[PDB]
Scaffold this motif. Sequence first.
Motif, PDB file in Angstrom:
ATOM      1  N   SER A 387       0.796  -1.198   0.000  1.00 31.24           N
ATOM      2  CA  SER A 387       0.000   0.000   0.000  1.00 31.24           C
ATOM      3  C   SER A 387       0.852   1.282   0.000  1.00 31.24           C
ATOM      4  N   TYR A 388       2.040   1.242   0.586  1.00 32.15           N
ATOM      5  CA  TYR A 388       2.937   2.408   0.623  1.00 32.15           C
ATOM      6  C   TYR A 388       3.620   2.785  -0.723  1.00 32.15           C
ATOM      7  N   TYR A 389       3.490   1.895  -1.710  1.00 33.82           N
ATOM      8  CA  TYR A 389       4.045   2.076  -3.044  1.00 33.82           C
ATOM      9  C   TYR A 389       2.897   2.536  -3.969  1.00 33.82           C
ATOM     10  N   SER A 452       2.816  -7.961  -1.622  1.00 32.29           N
ATOM     11  CA  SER A 452       2.855  -7.473  -0.251  1.00 32.29           C
ATOM     12  C   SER A 452       3.415  -8.420   0.801  1.00 32.29           C
ATOM     13  N   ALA A 453       3.570  -7.969   2.043  1.00 27.46           N
ATOM     14  CA  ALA A 453       4.244  -8.802   3.054  1.00 27.46           C
ATOM     15  C   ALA A 453       3.450 -10.122   3.179  1.00 27.46           C
ATOM     16  N   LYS A 454       2.134  -9.944   3.303  1.00 25.61           N
ATOM     17  CA  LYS A 454       1.166 -11.003   3.258  1.00 25.61           C
ATOM     18  C   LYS A 454       0.272 -10.688   2.085  1.00 25.61           C
TER      19      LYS A 454
ATOM     20  N   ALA B  18       0.950  -8.061  17.556  1.00 25.53           N
ATOM     21  CA  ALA B  18      -0.440  -7.880  17.205  1.00 25.53           C
ATOM     22  C   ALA B  18      -1.174  -9.213  17.254  1.00 25.53           C
ATOM     23  N   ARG B  19      -0.591 -10.252  16.688  1.00 29.03           N
ATOM     24  CA  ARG B  19      -1.270 -11.534  16.783  1.00 29.03           C
ATOM     25  C   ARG B  19      -1.568 -11.893  18.256  1.00 29.03           C
ATOM     26  N   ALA B  20      -0.579 -11.641  19.138  1.00 33.61           N
ATOM     27  CA  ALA B  20      -0.645 -12.064  20.557  1.00 33.61           C
ATOM     28  C   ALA B  20      -1.796 -11.381  21.306  1.00 33.61           C
ATOM     29  N   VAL B  38       8.619   1.870  14.716  1.00 39.04           N
ATOM     30  CA  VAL B  38       8.195   0.503  14.837  1.00 39.04           C
ATOM     31  C   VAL B  38       7.307   0.183  13.601  1.00 39.04           C
ATOM     32  N   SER B  39       7.169  -1.052  13.133  1.00 36.12           N
ATOM     33  CA  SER B  39       6.414  -1.338  11.906  1.00 36.12           C
ATOM     34  C   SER B  39       6.737  -0.283  10.839  1.00 36.12           C
ATOM     35  N   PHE B  40       8.029  -0.109  10.532  1.00 34.26           N
ATOM     36  CA  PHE B  40       8.398   0.722   9.377  1.00 34.26           C
ATOM     37  C   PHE B  40       8.508  -0.088   8.068  1.00 34.26           C
ATOM     38  N   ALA B  41       8.256   0.538   6.936  1.00 28.36           N
ATOM     39  CA  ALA B  41       8.357  -0.169   5.661  1.00 28.36           C
ATOM     40  C   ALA B  41       9.820  -0.287   5.239  1.00 28.36           C
ATOM     41  N   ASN B  42      10.522  -1.285   5.753  1.00 24.40           N
ATOM     42  CA  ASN B  42      11.927  -1.377   5.406  1.00 24.40           C
ATOM     43  C   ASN B  42      12.014  -1.391   3.892  1.00 24.40           C
ATOM     44  N   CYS B  43      11.148  -2.128   3.207  1.00 24.06           N
ATOM     45  CA  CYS B  43      11.308  -2.325   1.780  1.00 24.06           C
ATOM     46  C   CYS B  43      11.155  -1.049   0.928  1.00 24.06           C
ATOM     47  N   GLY B  44      10.549   0.011   1.477  1.00 24.33           N
ATOM     48  CA  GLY B  44      10.279   1.261   0.726  1.00 24.33           C
ATOM     49  C   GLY B  44      11.383   2.323   0.745  1.00 24.33           C
TER      50      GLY B  44
HETATM   51  C1  LIG Z   1       1.285  -4.383  10.514  1.00 21.85           C
HETATM   52  C2  LIG Z   1       1.939  -5.329  11.542  1.00 21.85           C
HETATM   53  C3  LIG Z   1       2.265  -4.569  12.843  1.00 21.85           C
HETATM   54  C4  LIG Z   1       1.010  -6.513  11.839  1.00 21.85           C
HETATM   55  O1  LIG Z   1      -0.304  -6.099  12.144  1.00 21.85           O
HETATM   56  P1  LIG Z   1      -1.467  -7.200  11.997  1.00 21.85           P
HETATM   57  O2  LIG Z   1      -2.791  -6.664  12.508  1.00 21.85           O
HETATM   58  O3  LIG Z   1      -1.109  -8.533  12.637  1.00 21.85           O
HETATM   59  O4  LIG Z   1      -1.377  -7.578  10.436  1.00 21.85           O
HETATM   60  P2  LIG Z   1      -2.452  -7.124   9.359  1.00 21.85           P
HETATM   61  O5  LIG Z   1      -2.676  -5.658   9.252  1.00 21.85           O
HETATM   62  O6  LIG Z   1      -1.995  -7.742   8.088  1.00 21.85           O
HETATM   63  O7  LIG Z   1      -3.755  -7.940   9.753  1.00 21.85           O
HETATM   64  C5  LIG Z   1      -3.613  -9.334   9.879  1.00 21.85           C
HETATM   65  C6  LIG Z   1      -4.885  -9.806  10.571  1.00 21.85           C
HETATM   66  O8  LIG Z   1      -6.088  -9.367   9.945  1.00 21.85           O
HETATM   67  C7  LIG Z   1      -6.955 -10.454   9.645  1.00 21.85           C
HETATM   68  N1  LIG Z   1      -7.681 -10.058   8.450  1.00 21.85           N
HETATM   69  C8  LIG Z   1      -7.137  -9.439   7.342  1.00 21.85           C
HETATM   70  N2  LIG Z   1      -8.109  -8.986   6.510  1.00 21.85           N
HETATM   71  C9  LIG Z   1      -9.299  -9.297   7.048  1.00 21.85           C
HETATM   72  C10 LIG Z   1     -10.603  -9.061   6.618  1.00 21.85           C
HETATM   73  N3  LIG Z   1     -10.898  -8.162   5.660  1.00 21.85           N
HETATM   74  N4  LIG Z   1     -11.634  -9.522   7.394  1.00 21.85           N
HETATM   75  C11 LIG Z   1     -11.362 -10.177   8.584  1.00 21.85           C
HETATM   76  N5  LIG Z   1     -10.072 -10.384   9.023  1.00 21.85           N
HETATM   77  C12 LIG Z   1      -9.046  -9.949   8.273  1.00 21.85           C
HETATM   78  C13 LIG Z   1      -5.983 -11.591   9.441  1.00 21.85           C
HETATM   79  O9  LIG Z   1      -6.472 -12.860   9.765  1.00 21.85           O
HETATM   80  C14 LIG Z   1      -4.955 -11.309  10.504  1.00 21.85           C
HETATM   81  O10 LIG Z   1      -5.441 -11.670  11.757  1.00 21.85           O
HETATM   82  P3  LIG Z   1      -4.962 -12.999  12.441  1.00 21.85           P
HETATM   83  O11 LIG Z   1      -3.450 -13.184  12.481  1.00 21.85           O
HETATM   84  O12 LIG Z   1      -5.485 -12.747  13.843  1.00 21.85           O
HETATM   85  O13 LIG Z   1      -5.611 -14.222  11.771  1.00 21.85           O
HETATM   86  C15 LIG Z   1       3.239  -5.919  10.986  1.00 21.85           C
HETATM   87  O14 LIG Z   1       2.983  -6.891   9.991  1.00 21.85           O
HETATM   88  C16 LIG Z   1       4.263  -4.840  10.704  1.00 21.85           C
HETATM   89  O15 LIG Z   1       4.833  -4.236  11.818  1.00 21.85           O
HETATM   90  N6  LIG Z   1       4.601  -4.474   9.470  1.00 21.85           N
HETATM   91  C17 LIG Z   1       5.621  -3.486   9.157  1.00 21.85           C
HETATM   92  C18 LIG Z   1       7.019  -4.105   9.098  1.00 21.85           C
HETATM   93  C19 LIG Z   1       7.196  -4.957   7.843  1.00 21.85           C
HETATM   94  O16 LIG Z   1       6.342  -5.809   7.510  1.00 21.85           O
HETATM   95  N7  LIG Z   1       8.275  -4.655   7.110  1.00 21.85           N
HETATM   96  C20 LIG Z   1       9.507  -5.385   6.844  1.00 21.85           C
HETATM   97  C21 LIG Z   1       9.954  -5.036   5.429  1.00 21.85           C
HETATM   98  S1  LIG Z   1       8.594  -4.320   4.432  1.00 21.85           S
END
Ligand SMILES: CC(C)(COP(=O)(O)OP(=O)(O)OC[C@H]1O[C@@H](n2cnc3c(N)ncnc32)[C@H](O)[C@@H]1OP(=O)(O)O)[C@@H](O)C(=O)NCCC(=O)NCCS
Lengths: 565, 565
Positions: A387-389, A452-454, B18-20, B38-44
């Motif tokens: 989304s950031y791109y 994306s990451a996921k 977040a999962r926890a 925290v949660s920065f877009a390293n890839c961007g």
């Molecule tokens: C964003 C971050 C903090 C994780 O937050 P998160 O809430 O766990 O992850 P998401 O925003 O993807 O949401 C995932 C959850 O939403 C749920 N979900 C997603 N879309 C949904 C939908 N539309 N309806 C219902 N549930 C949904 C998924 O099941 C998942 O929940 P679960 O693990 O409990 O099953 C983390 O991934 C992060 O810090 N990212 C930045 C760092 C990074 O990724 N960069 C490294 C290089 S780019």
Amino acid sequence: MKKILIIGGVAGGASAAARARRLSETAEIIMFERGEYVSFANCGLPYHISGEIAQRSALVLQTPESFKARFNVEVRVKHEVVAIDRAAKLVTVRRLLDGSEYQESYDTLLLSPGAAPIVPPIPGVDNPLTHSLRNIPDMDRILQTIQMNNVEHATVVGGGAIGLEMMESLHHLGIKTTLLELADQVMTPVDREMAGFAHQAIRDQGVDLRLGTALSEVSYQVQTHVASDAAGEDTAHQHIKGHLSLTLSNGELLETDLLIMAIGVRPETQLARDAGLAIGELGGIKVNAMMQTSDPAIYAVGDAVEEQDFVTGQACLVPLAGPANRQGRMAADNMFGREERYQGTQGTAICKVFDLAVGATGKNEKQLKQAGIAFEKVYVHTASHASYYPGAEVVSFKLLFDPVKGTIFGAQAVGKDGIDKRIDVMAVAQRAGMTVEQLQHLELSYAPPYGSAKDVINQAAFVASNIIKGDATPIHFDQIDNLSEDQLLLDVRNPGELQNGGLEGAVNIPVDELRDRMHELPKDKEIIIFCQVGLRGNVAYRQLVNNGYRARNLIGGYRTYKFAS
Amino acid sequence: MKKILIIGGVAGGASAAARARRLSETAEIIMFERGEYVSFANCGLPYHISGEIAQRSALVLQTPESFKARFNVEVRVKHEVVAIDRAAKLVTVRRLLDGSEYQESYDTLLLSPGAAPIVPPIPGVDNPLTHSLRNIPDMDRILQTIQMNNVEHATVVGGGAIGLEMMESLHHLGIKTTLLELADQVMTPVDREMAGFAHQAIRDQGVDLRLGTALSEVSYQVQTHVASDAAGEDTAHQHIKGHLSLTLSNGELLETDLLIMAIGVRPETQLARDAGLAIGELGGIKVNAMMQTSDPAIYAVGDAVEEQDFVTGQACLVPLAGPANRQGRMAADNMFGREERYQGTQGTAICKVFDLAVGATGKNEKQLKQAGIAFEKVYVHTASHASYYPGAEVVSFKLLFDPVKGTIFGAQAVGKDGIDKRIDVMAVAQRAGMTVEQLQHLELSYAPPYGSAKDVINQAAFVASNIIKGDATPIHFDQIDNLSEDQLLLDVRNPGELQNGGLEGAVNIPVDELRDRMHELPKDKEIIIFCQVGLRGNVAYRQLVNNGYRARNLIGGYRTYKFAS
Ligand SMILES: CC(C)(COP(=O)(O)OP(=O)(O)OC[C@H]1O[C@@H](n2cnc3c(N)ncnc32)[C@H](O)[C@@H]1OP(=O)(O)O)[C@@H](O)C(=O)NCCC(=O)NCCS
Ligand SMILES: Cc1cc2nc3c(=O)[nH]c(=O)nc-3n(C[C@H](O)[C@H](O)[C@H](O)COP(=O)(O)OP(=O)(O)OC[C@H]3O[C@@H](n4cnc5c(N)ncnc54)[C@H](O)[C@@H]3O)c2cc1C
Ligand SMILES: Cc1cc2nc3c(=O)[nH]c(=O)nc-3n(C[C@H](O)[C@H](O)[C@H](O)COP(=O)(O)OP(=O)(O)OC[C@H]3O[C@@H](n4cnc5c(N)ncnc54)[C@H](O)[C@@H]3O)c2cc1C
Ligand SMILES: CC(C)(COP(=O)(O)OP(=O)(O)OC[C@H]1O[C@@H](n2cnc3c(N)ncnc32)[C@H](O)[C@@H]1OP(=O)(O)O)[C@@H](O)C(=O)NCCC(=O)NCCS
């Protein structure tokens, strides 16, 4: 010496002819095409009508001459096979050049006659301003009506692939269009609520889309008056080949200059029937997996045959080129005794719809209900890439599965970007016998401009899995409007978002304030929760069950819902 | 209650956090991050350096406050954990604000400290104009040098993903650039011949690419003369923060205004090795598939961990986001007794290189040789969508498999369009346990603007399957230069095509005359055949083999060869 004869020379026939030559130099191969051209691009026919495909030469991929020099295959164009006599092992062929007849013997025969556009039993539908499309001459007549009739309004009848492409082509030539569909949606491979995104894209273009509507009657009126400049009239909005007045199922009247018949296709069964080869229950030639008709010397492939659905095993009719080609190659293989079996059709499809792509694979909600297969389904609306791109587009994607065994039934996807990618991941996933819990572990390509990451496939996976494990509890877009008296409706979006649409009488506590404001909700009620797209909703649901509330989350969110209305 | 501490707050840590919370409302969750974000877009980071990602804020996906409000986790930034006492279940944390320290207790601990850029032992390389890229401040320094030193020529060391991305990003900014790699190619996940397409594309941009060469010394000399407009000097090309003089392994000098160090990364293992945790042979933390270190109260995820390679079972180090996130979430699951196991790493990668995407999954040719695994390989150059529809692009694709069992080892693709799609497909497929014979029966989505009757993959499948079954016999690009006088080189392209490159000494009989001209080729020699792409060659091969000649087809034709040096 093997003598092989091939009836029809496109996707099925021609794929067989080339493979048969690659597998034998000694074999005699003769290919009958009733029309002028073989190996044409049926799929691009509307793209030429629009000019998107500029040169018609692009639509012919092989020629009788190319097939002789490359593959030592005799193509006979303008030769229609008019009967098979099995006992004798002879076909009777007519030369359309002059109506004369001859017969040719065979060791093995392949039938690949395709499917003809349905003509509906509709008064006066056969007229000079009404055309179907399956081949170049059908296209030329369309083209010739647009120039001769100065077409400014045109009506397509049929909301499947062809009809949608035709509607879009005419739009591109700057003609006002009406599309009509008997059904409650275009593109039946996807479910109605998915079609919804297509519906708005079509309307947003100034196309006049009438769903749930039939053409009742066509009156065609010859033009008796030629306006001329000599006579001080205006020649710009004239229609010299005449005019059509359509009558719709609802008594209404449509005035149009051209009418395109795209209501689907029906297998060319006539030769097969006459020859006493078995026809299945759906009107298509019966074949085994090999793919023999009820005569072992005669194979059949392509749009003419019934094949096995991958998921259900039931017979189904799927007019798609990919299976036709691959069947045709396999049929060659079996002519030389390779005993290869064809592995069912998933009905993988995609169609462009202005800025959208709508695709699907496997089975839909409609087909799963009407076969009494219990299923569950999930929705996500996640960005095509990080989304950031810039240039991410929302992929809306439905996954249908066995709520217990995890089986993948179907998936569908509508969006501006990366739809083909997602339907293929799924098509291979489901063919490989993956189940939703395993989808979670997919590892796809993530660089900011490609993914994306996921990936949506990963998020759909988690969401269905949470539901299978009891970690989430769905409610759907169609159950939320009838709500019991021990059920409370919670909107967890921010207040600024309510102006875009909501549900009547919902309580609004935004997710990021919920933990703190939980005591505002009565533990004696079941909490029914909705975000915009599902995702915040699931955060709320977890907060709540974790504190001992009964809850449900609106799968796919207000979005899924909104576009179902 | 459960007290959970997380070390690191990005891909691994934050996914865990977040999962926890979604699993328990009662757990204490504290997450230490040594940096400010925290949660920065390293890839961007590279893409914001270029301005492609316009806004700094787009790079921050969560905040300490967002994480407290939504997930009630306590994010402590600028707190660097400096010791773990396993026996005591205590960590020691330093507040970077004032260097004060304090102990914090845990029930379970999670390690996600990432991987540092490699420090090469290079004289002089630590200096004000040379930078590595790990995070947002590194990003800011690079921007600062760019602005203050008026960078007009910049040098990148490292030809992997991050290297290519900075090389590209600086080029978008106008800066004349140089890229250095020690290996004989960029993008190691694919193979030299596949990298070939990228090298060409990089040079076409006016970038100075020097493969197989290292930086030996850096001499940094400070600027002493400030050119002035008051003095009547030209100020346009000044670099007031100084100059760099690089000495390369081949003796040559290189003058430049900024030097970007991108020669890979090495796991943060200090804290782990100080506490006596198991470390693997590759230098990352050892975990089981549940993500537990050798202290079972301590999980570890992300870049610092050695993971289980999908194809071999062996350990690997792969620094990717997708895995890190998903590892992190599963770590959270495991902390709540769910005992889920990670299912190996495919190495799925993709990278933009100007107009091209270069991508892969699985194992490459180098990795397979070096591990003594027997393999074969197929190449294919198919259009990304039906050729007759505008905008097709050549998809060069490599498939690596077991010639007897059909096991899928890896795949690679390079081109202008549809590469992410064909790499995702392969990933699913190999992770679903598909074999090459099975790839033949894939049903992907075909409409003219999106795929083909037979997709890139279907074709690749036919090619390898044909070799699996002895319906083809290969020769490869590296083999065709060493021919024997049992072998006759035959070029089946048309005479016109020879102008664009050829192999010396070859006999030219274009495929379409070959049937009639076959007698011209002695049956006492083995015919080594090449088309441009492989296709016409496989037609010629079938003709000859079918008439009792012995033959090989040069897989990937002249195009594969062309790009292999
Ligand atoms: C964003 C971050 C903090 C994780 O937050 P998160 O809430 O766990 O992850 P998401 O925003 O993807 O949401 C995932 C959850 O939403 C749920 N979900 C997603 N879309 C949904 C939908 N539309 N309806 C219902 N549930 C949904 C998924 O099941 C998942 O929940 P679960 O693990 O409990 O099953 C983390 O991934 C992060 O810090 N990212 C930045 C760092 C990074 O990724 N960069 C490294 C290089 S780019
Ligand atoms: C407008 C249009 C758009 C399409 N778009 C797509 C798409 O995007 N994706 C996709 O997968 N599919 C698409 N298709 C469908 C695809 O064209 C068909 O599934 C495929 O062509 C079927 O191949 P076939 O061999 O069964 O029959 P055909 O392609 O119909 O070829 C059969 C041939 O046999 C000949 N024949 C019939 N009877 C005789 C006779 N007795 N003697 C000699 N010859 C005979 C016919 O003349 C015909 O030319 C589209 C089709 C159309 C019409
Ligand atoms: C420029 C760049 C581009 C990239 N592009 C891609 C890509 O396109 N696709 C892809 O899949 N991957 C990409 N990656 C890699 C991806 O960012 C990593 O694989 C991922 O971030 C690994 O997650 P992690 O949690 O292990 O490490 P990190 O994201 O590095 O997070 C670890 C955090 O912990 C902090 N920390 C470390 N030690 C301590 C300590 N002891 N006490 C307290 N805090 C500590 C660190 O400062 C760091 O902030 C890219 C990386 C970079 C740098
Ligand atoms: C084009 C047509 C004649 C097929 O002939 P074909 O020669 O078998 O088709 P292709 O160009 O795809 O060739 C595929 C062959 O090349 C081989 N191949 C493909 N790329 C190769 C490569 N680079 N190197 C070596 N072999 C290769 C494949 O193995 C396959 O041969 P096989 O079946 O012996 O294994 C037929 O598909 C046709 O008439 N199509 C147009 C009409 C149509 O499909 N209409 C539907 C509506 S769009």
